[PDB]
Amino acid sequence: PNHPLWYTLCDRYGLYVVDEANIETHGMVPMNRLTDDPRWLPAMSERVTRMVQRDRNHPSVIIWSLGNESGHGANHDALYRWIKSVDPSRPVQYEGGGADTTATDIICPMYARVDEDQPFPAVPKWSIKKWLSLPGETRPLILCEYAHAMGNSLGGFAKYWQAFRQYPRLQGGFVWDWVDQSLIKYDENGNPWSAYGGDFGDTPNDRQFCM
Amino acid sequence: RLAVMVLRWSDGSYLEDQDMWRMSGIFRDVSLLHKPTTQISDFHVATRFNDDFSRAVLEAEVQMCGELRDYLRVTVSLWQGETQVASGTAPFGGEIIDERGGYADRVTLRLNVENPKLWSAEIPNLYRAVVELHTADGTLIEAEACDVGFREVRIENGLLLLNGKPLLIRGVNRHEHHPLHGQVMDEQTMVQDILLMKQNNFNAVRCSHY
Ligand SMILES: O=C1O[C@H](CO)[C@H](O)[C@H](O)[C@H]1O
Ligand SMILES: [Mg+2]
Ligand code: NA
Ligand code: NA
């Protein structure tokens, strides 16, 4: 959840918001190790419920998200249902566990390609046009992350937009992402420069991947 | 002496506007068929399966014409080559259908078949079903027959399944056409077409459009 003023600005200026719980356990092995554990349900539930209680009156918030990259665990299913019961006025989405679990109203993959499948075991990233028509599938698809804008990037962006416009159920996506996470450091003469992962003595690090 | 007046055009023509040569005449076989007064006048074969196709029930509804008699029976027997695999015998008179009873002139036979050999375009396994109309004592009145393929066709979850597996149709539309005989078909041309199709990786044909 963001600084409270962000929602007020989005209400007034006009932007649609996906308000997301402060839950990411990406580093776990497997990713759902905590989220499938009932002992971690109280802690997860408070990150979800206290968000809804704070933000539910903002019209800019149109979708609730259960967090990010925490696999898919039974705790997600429980909290999906909690929100659906407490606030029927907004869809719930969540990407973990393959982007199309029973804990999401919207198929919301990250970096699924337009035409090319990436059939990873257990959590495949189908071509988005193919994903829509998988036997039994009815939901809309909106990418929670696509077109990774790291450095000299965004090649093939038009290809997403051609598909979004042609397919009713492809309803767009969220580019990753807005702003380079660089930090200012100074040289001996007091000149500012853009620093990334590893420039502060932080180890292990992931270098320019923050940008 | 038979006399046949064939008309090129009729009100039927309005429903026969297929994109092809418009021709006319007695273009398919003519035959004479002798049946007994007490006859099999219709018969349907159904095959249905358990979840993994390791068991089947062959169901045969048989209709008769002529005078009803207590001594009348139908036997449906099912054959794999020269080996009889299943058989059923019953008198006429179907289940109750409504307030007025059932069909006294029909009977349904049900035969169990374990581990049936399944029919597909890949392996066209066939059994032979013989439908015998006869007396309880064993005198044959007549027999009809057909080839039986044990297979289930269904649409499930948006997929067309044959024997539970999603089909990939390598099909072609095929009109009945011969450059010398027009729309008269013969076994040799038919066989030639089939062989070519299968030699060229086709598994399906559409009867375009009749
Ligand atoms: O759509 C069609 O066009 C074909 C053109 O060859 C042919 O006339 C078919 O009978 C018809 O269904
Ligand atoms: Mg036509
Ligand atoms: Na669309
Ligand atoms: Na990053």
Curated annotation (Swiss-Prot), chain A:
Leader sequence segment: none
Keywords (A to Z) from UniProt: Glycosidase, Hydrolase, Magnesium, Manganese, Metal-binding, Sodium
Induction of its expression: By allolactose.
Disulfide bonds: none
Any single biological process term in GO: lactose catabolic process
Binding site for Na(+): F209
Amino-acid positions noted as binding Mg(2+) 2 in the UniProt annotation, renumbered to this chain: N205
UniProt: Mg(2+) 1 binding residues: E24, H26, E69
Active site: E69 (proton donor), E145 (nucleophile)
Residues that bind substrate: E69, E145, Y146, A147, H148
Keyword Metal-binding (UniProt): yes
GO CC annotation: beta-galactosidase complex
Record's keyword annotation contains Signal: no
GO molecular function list: alkali metal ion binding; beta-galactosidase activity; carbohydrate binding; identical protein binding; magnesium ion binding
Family statement: Belongs to the glycosyl hydrolase 2 family.
Subunit details: Homotetramer.
Protein name (record): Beta-galactosidase
Parent-protein start and end of this portion: 394 to 604 of 1024
Curated annotation (Swiss-Prot), chain B:
Residues the record lists as binding substrate: D19
Swiss-Prot/TrEMBL site (Transition state stabilizer) positions: H175, H209
Resulting phenotype, H209 to E/F/K: Essentially inactive unless very rapid purification. Causes very large destabilizations of the transition state
Source organism, top-level taxon: Bacteria
Induction: By allolactose.
Chain residues that bind Na(+): D19
Impact when changing D19F: Obliterates all binding and catalysis
Family, per entry: Belongs to the glycosyl hydrolase 2 family.
Subunit structure: Homotetramer.
Name of the protein in question: Beta-galactosidase
Organism: Escherichia coli (strain K12)
Portion of the full-length sequence here: 184 to 393 of 1024
